[PDB]
Structure 1
Amino acid sequence: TKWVLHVDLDQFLASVELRRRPDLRGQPVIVGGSRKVVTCASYEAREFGVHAGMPLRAAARRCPDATFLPSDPAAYDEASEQVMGLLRDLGHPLEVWGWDEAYLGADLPDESDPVEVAERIRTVVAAETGLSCSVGISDNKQRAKVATGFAKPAGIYVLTEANWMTVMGDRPPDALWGVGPKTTKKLAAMGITTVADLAVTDPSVLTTAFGPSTGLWLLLLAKGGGDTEVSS
């Protein structure tokens, strides 16, 4: 059996800063750089509606008691390379995206539980770097990344054909990875508001609205499919 695991570091920039400044643990921390915007908001800060991308002044308005730290890219680079090297050295095909994400493939004995590979990944990363990460598990990239959302924070989650529709069916199309807000507004205008509805929509409805290939890709995503090749 061929599996795909997606690894995502928890509140990466903030976590790296907390190494350098332990006193701040458990408190609203906001990292800001490049007019300056939020580059990473700690989970505590997010409870106040603060999110990556927003201007710092607007962030201060929402979380007056937060501690603002200057962005330090070179430390984030270093911290990421360490983690990525650690992932690569496990021997599986690996594909790195940005600083905090990676997809890795694992061809496993039909009986082996993939969750064990995920528990070792979490342990290695935590033991060697102090950082927590979450791991999504499936048989393609997109579904694995969606699985990661349910694993947050500091967790592991498995999404396959068995539980896919039960977990996703009633959610809006934008819960799918690869389907954004603009596409889901266009879909709402055509009377399509859940993943289950999109999954059984007639191909022609989608292809005339989004073109021949995009129409079909939306069906594949909604059925839980996606890219299967990781390739290092």
Structure 2
Amino acid sequence: MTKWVLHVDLDQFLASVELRRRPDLRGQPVIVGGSGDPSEPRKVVTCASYEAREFGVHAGMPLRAAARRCPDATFLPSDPAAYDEASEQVMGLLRDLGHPLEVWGWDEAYLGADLPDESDPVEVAERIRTVVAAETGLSCSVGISDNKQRAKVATGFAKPAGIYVLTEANWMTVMGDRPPDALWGVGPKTTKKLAAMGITTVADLAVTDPSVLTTAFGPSTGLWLLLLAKGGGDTEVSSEPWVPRSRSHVVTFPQDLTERREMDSAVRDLALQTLAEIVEQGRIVTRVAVTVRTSTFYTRTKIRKLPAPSTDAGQIVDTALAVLDQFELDRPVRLLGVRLELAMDDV
């Protein structure tokens, strides 16, 4: 018996969804962003089709930037209702396969297949591609390995519309020259710190003395990085309801903000908006965090724990309005954010 982990990632997801209802736009540059107006400032690309990516457009890029880089791209507004519906369909469809299925956000899922040892993980991956293509119209890629992090890395190589197998057999030969941030979990900061320790590749980190890392990163993070560099990872595909820990709404305003009357009303509204949504989900708030960001793009957040789990609107808005009070100035605030942390204990 061979335990496989398959990572299923829908290609160009938001674009592909748009493509189902604009099938004339296939093989053309399509950019999905804040409101379909590229001229609109303070807005960014949410998803760039593969054709738009050939001109350098990528998620995070301001839409003005991307229209300069790709003037013939069709810009479409974000339509979250249509993406929730596309997502639940394809997943709902992948539950119908009878393997354990772990869903990660919207596009992506992990599938646990224990295969007799007669069978072919490549074989299962194509079916998933064929059924997904045939029933939803969307295209997916599948990375295959024996643990979640390495399967995800395999998806990187499987894209677009493909399948890639990444195991102990080929991990180090495929990945050993890559910089540490190619690993899932590792970003530019860690890379930079590892660079300052003489570790500039996956292969270097894999043979790095445990002590160096556990002194530098903590006795659990240090060993985890070593695990990751050797291609290790989580191996259990948990098929259970994901329970959110928090919900949050931030907003960067069309105009910079200076007078506090606006600032208070925004954090009040964010607080209430957030709280109704979690009241709908049968959740209780534990702590209220407020975020401010200046014209600098400075950015700092503050949290306060409620005296007791609560759902009380007045007590929560006041806490949010009280935490906003601590932030120093009444500058040009670019962005205001409220996150509610939720109880994790019972229902």
Q: State whether TM-score is above 0.5.
A: yes
Match of 1:152 in 2: 159
Q: Deviations over 1:155-204 (max 9, x none)?
A: 00101111111111111111111211111111111110111110000011
Match of 1:27 in 2: 28
Deviation, structure 1 residue 64: 1.3
Distance in 1 separating the partners of 2:94 and 2:75: 31
Q: Deviations over 1:119-173 (max 9, x none)?
A: 1100000000111100000000000000101000000010111111111111111
Distance in 2 separating the partners of 1:157 and 1:114: 10
Deviation, structure 1 residue 20: 1.1
Distance in 1 separating the partners of 2:69 and 2:144: 35
Q: Deviations over 1:94-141 (max 9, x none)?
A: 110111000010111123111111011000000001111000000000
95-104 or 108-117: bigger deviation: 108-117
Distance in 2 separating the partners of 1:111 and 1:178: 34
Match of 2:146 in 1: 139
Q: Which has the higher strand share?
A: 2
Deviation, structure 1 residue 80: 0.6
Deviation, structure 1 residue 63: 1.0
Distance in 1 separating the partners of 2:28 and 2:180: 34
Distance in 2 separating the partners of 1:196 and 1:111: 33
TM-score where L is the length of structure 1: 0.98
Gaps of 5+ in 1: none
Match of 1:6 in 2: 7
Count of residue pairs the alignment pairs up: 231
**Aligned-partner SS, 1:212:** coil
- Which consecutive segments of 4 or more residues in structure 1 shift more than 3 A? none
**Aligned-partner SS, 1:27:** coil
Distance in 1 separating the partners of 2:23 and 2:144: 32
Distance in 1 separating the partners of 2:10 and 2:80: 16
Distance in 2 separating the partners of 1:200 and 1:132: 38
**Aligned-partner SS, 2:47:** strand
Deviation, structure 1 residue 37: 1.2
Distance in 2 separating the partners of 1:93 and 1:143: 18
Distance in 2 separating the partners of 1:156 and 1:200: 29
Match of 2:115 in 1: 108
Match of 1:191 in 2: 198
Radius of gyration: which is bigger? Answer: 2
Q: Pairwise CA RMSD of aligned residues?
A: 0.8
**Aligned-partner SS, 2:208:** coil
TM-score where L is the length of structure 2: 0.66
Distance in 2 separating the partners of 1:70 and 1:231: 34
Distance in 1 separating the partners of 2:113 and 2:188: 32
Distance in 2 separating the partners of 1:111 and 1:144: 21
Distance in 2 separating the partners of 1:133 and 1:184: 30
Distance in 2 separating the partners of 1:218 and 1:109: 32
Gaps of 5+ in 2: 35-41, 240-347
Matches within 5 A, 1:1-232: 1-33=2-34, 35-232=42-239
**Aligned-partner SS, 1:226:** coil
**Aligned-partner SS, 2:232:** coil
21-30 or 138-147: bigger deviation: 21-30
Deviation, structure 1 residue 53: 1.3
197-206 or 59-68: bigger deviation: 59-68
**Aligned-partner SS, 2:56:** coil
Larger RCO (alpha carbons 8 Å, 6+ apart) = 1
103-112 or 142-151: bigger deviation: 103-112
Q: Which has the higher helix share?
A: 1
